[PDB]
């Protein structure tokens, strides 16, 4: 066997790395966690440190609250019985208020109230996590790419749980918290709108989702193929093109007639991915607010 570089043959360890400092408030970093030899066959062995300032704590706590709020309900649904809770874990579901209660906060706790509570906690968890995305980049003086990108995922999520429910006039439109039930909701959403395969946004969204797998397969494989010339050192290949970046470009140029740069491929990447949820959120938002039936709309348009 020629060697492939999917798993490291030899791991190597030195002093825990505590990171760059730049404008980060160091008072808010933990200390290093342990080292995972397991991870280190494939990636870095070092866990932590993590940074937990105020926004960090806020986010993490509501996040758990959202999670426990669903879990208390799940236990309730299980009549507090350990064996039943496990047996039925994928079946339990925390459902939103019925259509009757509109967008109001009136519904009883056991029939929507809890759902609104968990959702509220989910809202603060995510938006605060978003800000943490921006702030951790700022402290290091980095571009805001990650937060811009995360915004695209947040878009689909907002549309499903918040914007589209509001525009439709009730919370009953939103996705329930449960493994099997959120799947049922997805299938049902499509049937009731005359089949999402007729939503042109839906099919763009798939093109990108398939495309992200295609692209990352291409890229990942390309980098590993030129890792015998230091290919994965991408920032330095951007600053000072090496033979890695040249062989990479030329593989593709010879294969398919055009190619990328070591910087540009990352622009193709971020956009392939981000467009999955962009077009996606658009498709969902338009459903039932403007277009009641994709098949039908397809026949006119």
């Amino acid at each position: 066997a020629e060697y492939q570089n999917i798993f490291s043959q030899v791991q190597v360890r030195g002093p825990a790395d505590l990171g760059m400092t730049e404008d980060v408030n160091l008072a808010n970093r933990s200390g290093v966690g342990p080292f995972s030899t397991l991870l280190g066959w494939f990636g870095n062995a070092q866990l932590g440190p993590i940074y937990l300032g105020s926004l960090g704590v806020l986010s993490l706590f509501s996040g758990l609250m959202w999670f426990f709020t669903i879990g208390i309900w799940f236990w309730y649904q299980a009549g507090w019985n350990p064996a039943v809770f496990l047996r039925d874990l994928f079946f339990f579901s925390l459902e939103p208020p019925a259509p009757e209660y509109g967008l109001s906060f009136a519904a009883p706790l056991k029939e929507g109230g809890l759902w609104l509570i968990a959702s509220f906690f989910m809202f603060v968890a995510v938006w605060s996590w978003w800000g943490r995305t921006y702030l951790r980049a700022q402290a290091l003086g980095m571009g805001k790419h990650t937060a811009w990108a995360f915004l695209s995922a947040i878009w689909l999520w907002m549309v499903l749980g918040f914007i589209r429910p509001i525009l439709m006039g009730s919370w009953s439109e939103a996705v329930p918290y449960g493994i099997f039930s959120h799947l049922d909701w997805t299938n049902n959403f499509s049937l009731v709108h005359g089949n999402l395969f007729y939503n042109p946004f839906h099919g763009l969204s798939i093109a990108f989702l398939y495309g992200s797998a295609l692209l990352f397969a291409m890229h990942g494989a390309t980098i590993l193929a030129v890792s015998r010339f230091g290919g994965e050192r991408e920032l330095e290949q951007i600053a000072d093109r090496g033979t890695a970046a040249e062989r990479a470009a030329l593989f593709w140029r010879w294969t398919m007639g055009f190619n990328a740069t070591m910087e540009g491929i990352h622009r193709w990447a971020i956009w392939m991915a981000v467009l999955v949820t962009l077009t996606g959120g658009i498709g969902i938002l338009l459903s039932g607010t403007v277009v009641d039936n994709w098949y039908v709309w397809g026949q006119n348009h």
Partner: protein
């Protein structure tokens, strides 16, 4: 109808984006050239983008791309045919001349630096706190080439400090000098390190580095180039 506006607008956006992305990917290698180095007539339908400048850290300078392009090296190849699009035959030894799958680029003759400003890659002997943490330690193993002859012995691992990974094995030859082999081009086995790209007699021709505790980008390119070239040029 809104959904119609949105979809139509979207195709227009996407065409804008593909354009932007394609021109972004033209910041290197362009303008296209004829086999002789002059500008090709046909550049295709995308224009070069407006230059951008990267500010390199540690007073290493800037980079402006696209910019005037240049191999900054002689290329020992000649045409094998009378028209565009055929192979160019090595005029000498392609391993020594660095062409074909033995190519290297004229990268900066300084070493890559970490974010602290220290050399990125060091031999482990000189790297404070660094030791093999898992897997068979190759240090001390005989090194065998694709001729099944022993070409030397592993005398250290050169490691990447910030990313904590092995990047080269340092190998000592019959004559007592050493060479770097890329970590990705060896197989560590229980009783030897095997190198399928080179036969024993080609080890001496691995490009040497000038300091024994650092490697420059230019020296990395020559080493990796030379070793990868053995896949074609050794048998």
């Amino acid at each position: 109808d809104l959904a119609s506006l949105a979809i139509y607008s979207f195709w227009i956006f996407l065409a804008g984006l593909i354009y932007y992305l394609q021109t972004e990917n033209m910041r290197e290698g362009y303008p296209l050239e004829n086999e002789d180095g002059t500008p090709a007539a046909n550049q295709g339908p995308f224009p070069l983008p407006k230059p951008k400048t990267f500010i390199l850290p540690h007073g290493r300078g800037t980079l402006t791309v696209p910019g005037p392009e240049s191999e900054d090296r002689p290329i020992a190849l000649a045409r094998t045919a009378v028209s565009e699009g055929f192979p160019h035959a090595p005029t000498g030894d392609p391993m020594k001349d660095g062409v074909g799958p033995a190519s290297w680029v004229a990268r900066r003759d300084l070493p890559e630096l970490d974010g602290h400003g220290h050399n990125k890659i060091k031999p482990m002997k000189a790297a404070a706190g660094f030791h093999v943490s898992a897997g068979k330690n190759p240090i001390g193993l005989p090194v065998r080439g694709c001729d099944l002859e022993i070409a030397g012995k592993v005398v250290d691992i050169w490691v990447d400090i910030p990313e904590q990974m092995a990047r080269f094995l340092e190998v000592e030859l019959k004559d007592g000098s050493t060479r770097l082999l890329p970590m990705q081009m060896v197989k560590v086995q229980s009783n030897r390190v095997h190198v399928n790209a080179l036969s024993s007699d080609l080890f001496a021709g691995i490009p040497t580095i000038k300091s024994p505790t650092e490697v420059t980008l230019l020296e990395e390119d020559k080493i990796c180039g030379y070793v990868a070239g053995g896949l074609m040029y050794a048998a």
